[PDB]
Amino acid sequence: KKPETPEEQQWLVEAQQAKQGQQDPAMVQAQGVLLQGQAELAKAQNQT
Amino acid sequence: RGQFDVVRPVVRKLVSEMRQNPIDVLYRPKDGARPDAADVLMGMYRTD
Numbered sequence: 338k339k340p341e342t343p344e345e346q347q348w349l350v351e352a353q354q355a356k357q358g359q360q361d362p363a364m365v366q367a368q369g370v371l372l373q374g375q376a377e378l379a380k381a382q383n384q385t
Numbered sequence: 386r387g388q389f390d391v392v393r394p395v396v397r398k399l400v401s402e403m404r405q406n407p408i409d410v411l412y413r414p415k416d417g418a419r420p421d422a423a424d425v426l427m428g429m430y431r432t433d
Contacts, residue, residue, distance in 0.1 A: 343419050 340349045410430050412423040 344421055 340346065340353075342349070410427050412427045414420060414422045
């Protein structure tokens with residue numbers, strides 16, 4: 338959307354870069370339920 | 386002296402229709418204007 342500064346400015350730009358910073362690890366972390374299946378490949382190499 | 390007065394039912398029909406149409410005050414801001422500029426005029430119109 339980008340700031341249009343209607344009555345607020347400081348809280349917009351601050352939390353804008355902070356919300357974008359949350360998105361980057363979050364999408365990778367969402368794969369965590371499927372990381373259980375990837376961990377089977379890790380355990381496969383570990384037992385051997 | 387006669388009357389049939391079908392005149393005034395048609396007038397009263399139109400009178401009841403224009404009172405239920407909403408014409409008063411709203412105010413929408415102009416291009417590049419803040420959205421909180423409308424309630425200044427509309428709010429002080431409604432006070433007095």
